[model samples]
Target: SLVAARAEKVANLYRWLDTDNDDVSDEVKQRMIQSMSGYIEHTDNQVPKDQAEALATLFVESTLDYDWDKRVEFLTKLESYGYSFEAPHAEKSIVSFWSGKNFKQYRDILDNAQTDGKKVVYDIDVKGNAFAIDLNKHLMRWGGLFLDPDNAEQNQLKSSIDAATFSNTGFWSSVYATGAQNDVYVIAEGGVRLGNYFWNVELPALRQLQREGLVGEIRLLDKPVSEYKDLPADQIGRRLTDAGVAVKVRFDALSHERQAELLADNPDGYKADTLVELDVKLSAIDSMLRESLPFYSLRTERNLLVQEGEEGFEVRSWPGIDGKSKTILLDNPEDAAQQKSIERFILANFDNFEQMPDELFLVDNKVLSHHDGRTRIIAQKEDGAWT
Candidate 1:
């Protein structure tokens, strides 16, 4: 709820910067953007007006790059494994929180970021004026610029939200700061800024641990619901299926502002329902400790494996959710709470909701679960990825 207030403010910032020969005052937009990003700005900081715009552009563009990359990676992998990327029209009424239909549109972000010889070039004003700023340009633009600690509202993003913190933050509760159910579910609208950080920054740490033999068995689960109401309405979710409803998803700390940047526009300058679409990604790491997973843990979660269906949808995880060809297996889950969490992960991590109950993945060592058809890829440890 508090984050929404910040979202509205961030929305205005986007509007201000969404121009050539900008209408919003450069001085005003400059400080507001730096603040929203939570990248501390000092009272004595003398960042040039043009440079500030560049930093804002840098923040916006860079975040987009990260988000798009993660989403594309997710889709790319699925397609590589021969999973369905497109769902039927009847299924259209129900959409995945992690849709990747337009992911290719963002494939050129890296190239675009380097459009002008290491600068993220784009028009901010008319008369051929534009930014040629490089990534992390803000670090230099506002070097020695730290927000005065006294301003409670003026906090710095000392660290990025990485997997360790995300794991500690405990998923849903970390971002939904309103104290919602520990296992609730929703479509992740404007969440990739949050999602991308975990996918790009957080998951890497866990994966490194995996590579180092400090961890094992990384898996992803999606939090999907057949009822549209499970995801809050009024976002692009409405466009996907006009009548879906669910608890609204919120952002935490930097997610509030960075989500605003993501929420602002699309790579193709796209917009719908006053809401912008964002990329979605999923990943996993089985562990014991916060920073480092022990060499072992009794990870029974994946005991309920996700598999790829062999025939016309839903066959792999035998006795599948389809409950037609195969049958429901028991001892697959322990109890209601455990099953709820397992199902929630399934819903939370999915990119295409329409394919649910019949999706794709390695259902077991010898089986693949694809209810019809899905591998890819957490945290909350004050990950310090900020200025």
Candidate 2:
């Protein structure tokens, strides 16, 4: 029954692997099956002849897709290497396997293959793209191989298990890292370690890569302001405030009746006040009634008339009470007294400045200029008016 159950479990694993091929081509899948079958047969005949079947059975037994707690229980009951497993070392081994620390260059090789359109096998490519073994580029091989063993106890099979485990970890790490989406082929020795690697390392890593694509990036948005570890909070906050200007201008342009309607429609008092606070300023509302006209543009035009004769300037006429040219001339070229007189005339008659099209006020600058930056300029538009 145990043999039947184990055989069925192994068969189920291959079936599941075939179903969830993860883009592996039929050719590659067939190749993988061939390798796995060979390894199982090889394990069925080892050096300690009588122990071969039992060892092969144990290897298959280890490959079960048990939950983490149950897996821990199974591993504890199984005899390790040659000696007892230390808790600290066992944890260390578990963490190292989970971490995938040795697979950095393997990941890089896969990434380079994807980006550069180069075919790479292990750390080297087929096109004589081997890394130089020069002093600087000396350690060009898979770094995963040189990582120290996690076994701390004497006669423990930790090193052998680690080597077997990490070798496949490196291979599959490359498989998933590659977005190559090609029918690329790979191989590994088949036995319990391959099965364990698939269940423990490869499966988790595949799902992790999937999580990153589907949900992990979204998780960042759910974090609190503090969780954005390296980003400058003050800079981001200020950037948001700067970007709020367009919204502020849009809201500010709304009529008071519409604004009041919005506030009333959004019955939530706190939210309404928040909307109000975002777009309104105290002085902007304060000076709505205290409008004043400035003489900067008017004075500049007057000075130009003095320099050129009355006929030399165009659009020099203003609106008159009678239907005559209301523009007064600076006839006495050097008369300071007459310039003062012209200033008085414009201030006195400025109210009717927009009544006629040929009226100098409208014919001149579209915006009235002021020296004081705090003063808002009066601008004329399609309405033929200014305020």
Candidate 3:
């Protein structure tokens, strides 16, 4: 992602330099001078641009017997004049001859040299131009420069030199940034101009790191029933449908007598494990409903409730009344005082209905065994005591 940003900046810079609408610019000339300076200062000779320009210029300036410095200076001046070499000089400099023997000799020298080595030699002619053979073992190449052309053969010879030296190298080199191989050339060629490279290459790599089970758990947003009410009508319907499915599965397992018995006796004695399973099934159903109605986003919260009975237990979600919180009243009026005490304890210690304390609903009834077995009850309360 960071590289993408940097690539954009570099592309903009390249666009600014090539102001004349031409792909090549004065900036490229300056870059060529800088590239050649590196070769002169250190014999690395890694001048891609200047090398191309020098090879092209050598063909035109070949007839002059000028030394290497004079030839370089003249070429530099020609670059300053926007690549316009004079007519007579250009005419005289076209190389027109190359003996196959000379090429064979240079090839032999290249083959004899060890890998990663280069040798260059200049030959002076009667004219102001000079001929040079640069033998590079690293490139496995040899090229000849012609200062003057006696015939078309000499021009063909120069073309042959370029083909022999530069063809294979150019063919294999990648000029696309983010492309395979050394991207330096691509970067220089303005490959960073594309915007998608950052999103395609960089952002996905970062997301992959985040996805591979990182340091912390990814928490889902808590969507309670009250929250679901605020969702769209369709979403509320989906949640209601999912909740209906869960309620059906739970009640279907109990007989009518068993359900009545659970409503009358120890309400909290209902199996906790079954309640947990109901929650899981409810969540799965909700997920399915969301998929079916994609535009409708609704989530149901787990609100486990248990009612103890004389014969067995009943487990279910807390019932709501008139879009408000509902209480499950006990049937055994004898334990009413204890239940009211428990309710008061809950209301006193955790009274903030909007933000109940964690694990607030759990009541340890171990101390009151008389209230446990005596006719358990689960009466739904809407407003007040049964009147």
Can you give the lDDT of residue 344 in candidate 3? 46
What do the candidate models score in CA lDDT, each in turn?
A: 0.28, 0.29, 0.27
**For residues 72-126, could you state the per-residue lDDT of candidate 1 as single tens digits?**
2322222333333222111111112233343223223222422444421111111
Candidate 3: tens digits of C-alpha lDDT, residues 50-128: 4545643342232122122233343333344343212221001111112222333332332233134533211111111
Considering TM-score, which of the candidate structures 1 and 3 is the better prediction for this target? Answer: 1
Clashing pairs in 2: 81-157
What's each prediction's TM-score?
Answer: 0.21, 0.17, 0.14
Output the lDDT of residue 264, model 3.
75
Best by TM-score: 1
| Full-model lDDT, candidate 3 | 0.27
Better of 1 and 3 by lDDT: 1
In angstroms, give how far residue 148 of model 3 lies from its true place: 30
Off by over 4 Å in 1: 1-29, 32-55, 61-134, 140-143, 149-152, 155-285, 289-354, 357-387
